Write a protein that binds this ligand. Structure first.
Ligand SMILES: [Cl-]
Ligand SMILES: [Cl-]
Length: 162
């Protein structure tokens, strides 16, 4: 198991534009295209991201390419964020993946705001952090996924994902 496989399980893979859990136009492996309600705006963003007239559909390879970019960007966003980096630096390899997963789903700004949880993680107070992370809109809206990520932080293993 690794970050790529983990996110592929959490996000799925769809080759045609779809709406995410929040109703936003997305494609591929959780690649958000836009928060606008216009499908046209989405199709436009899509063609700009792929470099061709897609007509709303992409290939597996193209989806995997967006995915690569997106994982890379998440890690880079973490490393450049004053609030996140120290947390990430303090964690083991498995747990790092859990943090990347959250940033991928919610953005750096989104995660950077889980101040209290962040501190607990940094202190290695696993059970406490697990509890605190659960008190969030994230957990209430996407509980199955949140549970997997939270168990990952709690145990430092990939058990939520065999
Ligand atoms: Cl991009
Ligand atoms: Cl879920």
């Amino acid at each position: 198991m690794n970050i790529f496989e983990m996110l592929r399980i959490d996000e799925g893979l769809r080759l045609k534009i779809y709406k995410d859990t929040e109703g936003y136009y997305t494609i591929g492996i959780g690649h958000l295209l836009t928060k606008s309600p216009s499908l046209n705006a989405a199709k436009s963003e899509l063609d700009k991201a792929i470099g061709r007239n897609t007509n709303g559909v992409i290939t597996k390879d193209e989806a995997e390419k967006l995915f690569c970019q997106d994982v890379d960007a998440a890690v880079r966003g973490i490393l450049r964020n004053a609030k996140l980096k120290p947390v990430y630096d303090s964690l083991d390899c498995v747990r790092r993946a859990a943090l990347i997963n959250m940033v991928f789903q919610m953005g750096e700004t989104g995660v950077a705001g889980f101040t209290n949880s962040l501190r607990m993680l940094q202190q290695k107070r696993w059970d406490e952090a697990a509890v605190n992370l659960a008190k969030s809109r994230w957990y209430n809206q996407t509980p199955n996924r949140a549970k997997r990520v939270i168990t990952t932080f709690r145990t430092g293993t990939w058990d939520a994902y065999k």
